[PDB]
Amino acid sequence: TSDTPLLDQIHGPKDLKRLSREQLPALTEELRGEIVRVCSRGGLHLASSLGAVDIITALHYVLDSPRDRILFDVGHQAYAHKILTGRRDQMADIKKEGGISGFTKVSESEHDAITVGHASTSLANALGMALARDAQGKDFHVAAVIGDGSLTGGMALAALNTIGDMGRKMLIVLNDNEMPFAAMGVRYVGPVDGHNVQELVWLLERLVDLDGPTILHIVTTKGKAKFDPATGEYVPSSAYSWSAAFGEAVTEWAKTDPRTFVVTPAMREGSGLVEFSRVHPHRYLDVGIAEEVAVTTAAGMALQGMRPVVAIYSTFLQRAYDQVLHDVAIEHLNVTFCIDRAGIVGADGATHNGVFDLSFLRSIPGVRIGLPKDAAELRGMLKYAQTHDGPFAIRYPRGNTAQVPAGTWPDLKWGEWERLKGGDDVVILAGGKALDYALKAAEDLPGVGVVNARFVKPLDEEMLREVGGRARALITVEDNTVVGGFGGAVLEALNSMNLHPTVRVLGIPDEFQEHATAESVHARAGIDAPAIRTVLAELGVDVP
Amino acid sequence: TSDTPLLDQIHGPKDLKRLSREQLPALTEELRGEIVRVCSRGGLHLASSLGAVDIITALHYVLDSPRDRILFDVGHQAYAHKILTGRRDQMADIKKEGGISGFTKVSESEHDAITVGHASTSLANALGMALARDAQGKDFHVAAVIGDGSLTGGMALAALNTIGDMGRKMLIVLNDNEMPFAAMGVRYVGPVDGHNVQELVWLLERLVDLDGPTILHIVTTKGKAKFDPATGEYVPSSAYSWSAAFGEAVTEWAKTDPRTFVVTPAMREGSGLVEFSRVHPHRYLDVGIAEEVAVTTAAGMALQGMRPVVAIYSTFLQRAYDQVLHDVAIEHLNVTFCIDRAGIVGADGATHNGVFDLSFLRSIPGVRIGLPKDAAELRGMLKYAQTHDGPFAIRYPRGNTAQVPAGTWPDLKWGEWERLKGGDDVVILAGGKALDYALKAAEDLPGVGVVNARFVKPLDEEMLREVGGRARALITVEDNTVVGGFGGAVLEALNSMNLHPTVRVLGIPDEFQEHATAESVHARAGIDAPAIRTVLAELGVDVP
Ligand SMILES: CC(=O)c1sc(CCOP(=O)(O)OP(=O)(O)O)c(C)[n+]1Cc1cnc(C)nc1N
Ligand SMILES: CC(=O)c1sc(CCOP(=O)(O)OP(=O)(O)O)c(C)[n+]1Cc1cnc(C)nc1N
Ligand SMILES: [Mg+2]
Ligand SMILES: [Mg+2]
Ligand code: NA
Ligand code: NA
Secondary structure: OOOOOOHHHOOOHHHHOOOOHHHHHHHHHHHHHHHHHHHOOOOOOHHHHHHOHHHHHHHHHHOOOOOOEEEEOOOOOOHHHHHHOOOHHHHHHOOOOOOOOOOOOOOOOOOOOOOOOOOOOHHHHHHHHHHHHHOOOOOOOEEEEEEHHHHOOHHHHHHHHHHHHHOOOEEEEEEEOOOOOOOOOOEEEEEEEOOOHHHHHHHHHOOOOOOOEEEEEEEOOOOOOEEOOOOOOEEOOOOOEHHHHHHHHHHHHHHHOOOEEEEEOOOHHHHOOHHHHHHOHHHEEEOOOOHHHHHHHHHHHHHOOOEEEEEEEHHHHHHHHHHHHHHHHOOOOOOEEEEEOEEOOOOOHHHOOEOOHHHHOOOOOOOEEEOOOOHHHHHHHHHHHOOOOOOEEEEOOOOEOOOOOOOOOOOOOOOOOEEEEOOOOEEEEEOOHHHHHHHHHOOOOOOEEEEEOOEEEOOOHHHHHHHHHHOOEEEEEEEEEOOOOHHHHHHHHHHHOOOOOEEEEEEEOOOOOOOOOHHHHHHHHOOOHHHHHHHHHHOOOOOO | OOOOOOHHHOOOHHHHOOOOHHHHHHHHHHHHHHHHHHHOOOOOOHHHHHHOHHHHHHHHHHOOOOOOEEEEOOOOOOHHHHHHOOOHHHHHHOOOOOOOOOOOOOOOOOOOOOOOOOOOOHHHHHHHHHHHHHOOOOOOOEEEEEEHHHHOOHHHHHHHHHHHHHOOOEEEEEEEOOOOOOOOOOEEEEEEEOOOHHHHHHHHHOOOOOOOEEEEEEEOOOOOOEEOOOOOOEEOOOOOEHHHHHHHHHHHHHHHOOOEEEEEOOOHHHHOOHHHHHHOHHHEEEOOOOHHHHHHHHHHHHHOOOEEEEEEEHHHHHHHHHHHHHHHHOOOOOOEEEEEOEEOOOOOHHHOOEOOHHHHOOOOOOOEEEOOOOHHHHHHHHHHHOOOOOOEEEEOOOOEOOOOOOOOOOOOOOOOOEEEEOOOOEEEEEOOHHHHHHHHHOOOOOOEEEEEOOEEEOOOHHHHHHHHHHOOEEEEEEEEEOOOOHHHHHHHHHHHOOOOOEEEEEEEOOOOOOOOOHHHHHHHHOOOHHHHHHHHHHOOOOOO
């Protein structure tokens, strides 16, 4: 009577092994149907997880998780893994607050061998587990599932070199859905049909106990209102994403400046560069999932007179920290960073929240940092960055902004804030996403000033000296960690001016933020409009 | 009458081309002699530069620098490059303050195509220059010299993938001195004799104008008081490097704790692990020049119950920022970081000064940060780190400390500072290298307290509340940038306690520090003993 008679009896991998191999194809058909029925919601990596159903079924049929360790790279392809490991009932609330993560998470289950979200980490983790295993006299199996895209990552390729050097027992499954390792010293098997679960089982049985590292190359298939040219995605009629504002802006700019060259690390759609790549094909570069290569290639362009734009998510820019510091900042090169997904991104959780860029970028000499309040101010920053010396970073959140007409290119002096609401008793300093909350919080409140602190590096020391000298209390708000971010920048400046007003630093706490909506995270962090109103009341302002 | 009749007439590459090819072997003999005579000083990469004399001679004989761009990876092997490009007279003062850099530097000469010091950047820079070249209608040559070691770096391997993808004109010389690229899509030539300058010229002439990227694989030879078991180097009889203190410490510790596993990214000697690798061969790992792999492999060990120790220089830890954040900190893993070369390192200049770790580590949740004042306190921190949950970082400078007897393992509570000199009027907060200056500065001065702020994360909030509440002024000193470091941490804590004393944040300015002794840099930065005395006088303390 049920659509999934086999899955209904499978509560874990030890129930899976009770089936016959001839029943595994029928199980893979149930798993694809289950993934579609429950995970056809918005913003779910449906195609990748569907493509990996057969390899995950065969791995759990052959190996003995949780004693055997199965590692997924990125982790977006492991919905069938979660379904087969006692989390079938939780798939309906995946990525929701209080539910299971969209990626594998060590805290979530003994079956999740690594916490992942960033790509290319599985191989180095697997090597560490294999080395620890041999240092403990144990012989459990270590297996890693890495896609063709993740394999291009630098830390995946380097780890391959070391894995072939140590010669320890481990299995690497290359999940290749885009339709050689002799110098590494690694056993190579394949390519084989990545959707033949019975054939996959046969192979894994006869590979998983061999000596030394092995790569099993499998081939799988990817996925077995108003239009937006930037992201190539249809959006609400009223919507206008920051990614789309950037895409339109840089597409316009490049029409008049042939020095502009846009580099992305395999995120053309997310960063909003679909239209750009078609209008300016001689000025668009995709370096794969290698943020390190994106920034240093841009530096090489800047050395030869170009004005490169690195489009990159805040969380991924973390991968290129040293390239920003060493390859860009030391010679003060003309690299512009347009940083999408700044701040809390929400449902993707701790591995993707970009709440650190105002901290690690700020400590790099010469790197200017700006936060636009709307699309016009984004274009002003982009125009300034593309026409002045040295590196500039422009960070904006995931979300929408007001659409601006073409040809809007204001002139702004970099480093100048702007007062948005009069008032000198309590003054709130906030830029970007935090500024939305601040204006909302102090909307009616007289004497509560609001300043668009749209530049984090440098600060507007003139306005901060004037405001800090006469304000009773200051409130800094940032979609960033409170440690070493915009709040710390204000305190460093005030102290060096020997100004000592009361200051309340509002931001993300020194704690990783689990998956949940950004509105929920900002409410619990204390930066949304009601929480700012609470701080205003603790400071003695009459709040309703 | 002169030892170098040929070199005496060579003031630049256009004079080199006037020679006959039969004179090039004699020139390479002059260049080796010149490098030995002038660069046989202390701490110079003599062997690497000697090994690359023939390839550098042939490249400059064939190419037309500065219009042609020759890129060196790391840059330690390019002494003959500097000699052939008008800097022969400056080799006597190389790495000295006011002299030329030990590596290539764009600011130094039009012949230095990239500023380097960290490894594996040449390939991505070369790709950017080649892309910029083609985007400008120009046809100059782009050539990169990368060693076998640098080629194992992740960003070198990933860049190789993209270089083979773009198919642009460029030459990569693999300088292989440690005695395959079909999937990349790159032309492969070699291996050839890397010391046959005439044969090298012949090849470069017939390769440098071909289409697409080419790899020229050459084979070269590496280098054509009391003993210290840690670094394997003889040192002054009274000396005792921090690297040697760490090596002895972890060698002792691992004898009693089999969970301890030491990972280094190809810096066994510098980190002081020569003896360790011989006493504990089943607990020592070398991952090549891949800091990214070192940290994530350690995370994989920590997931399997081990207590890994990542030994790594502060400047190189910058390469593993995201791996510390994403792979270690998110699940609060038991990874201990022993961070050598913390602070200003001196003669190696801007590419090596480790003055950022107290800033980028501090913004990562759960990462504890300690600064030992001597070897006993280092062992106390190492013992604490290896027996408590979560990640810990321990940073120490290049330099010497007092030698401690074996079996010294004090118990310290992590997060507790210690008052070293009484006094409550002005209190100086300083740890590690900065604490040496502070104790020196306030040695005789009564009422000037000195606190060993040996923990940056967390701060000793109890002592800081007491001291900040009653002190007239505070002075924070750190061998770190003043932006977001220990000074900012103190200000963030004081502000959240609503304590507003006068504070002077002393540290490295928000500017890269050129090559010079650490004593000179600290004097100009304002953290040495006389500069602290100057700050004490500006605060009203009677100073001699
Ligand atoms: C989920 C996410 O954020 C993904 S999934 C993905 C492509 C992976 O390709 P692969 O072949 O490995 O798998 P496939 O798409 O299923 O075929 C990227 C670039 N990203 C973004 C990204 C960017 N950069 C880094 C360091 N990590 C991630 N996860
Ligand atoms: C100079 C310096 O700091 C060197 S030279 C070197 C070995 C390079 O091997 P290669 O084969 O490329 O050249 P060779 O030794 O001459 O044979 C290392 C690891 N380091 C330290 C180091 C560590 N990590 C990084 C990112 N960069 C550097 N420069
Ligand atoms: Mg793929
Ligand atoms: Mg070498
Ligand atoms: Na610029
Ligand atoms: Na620990």
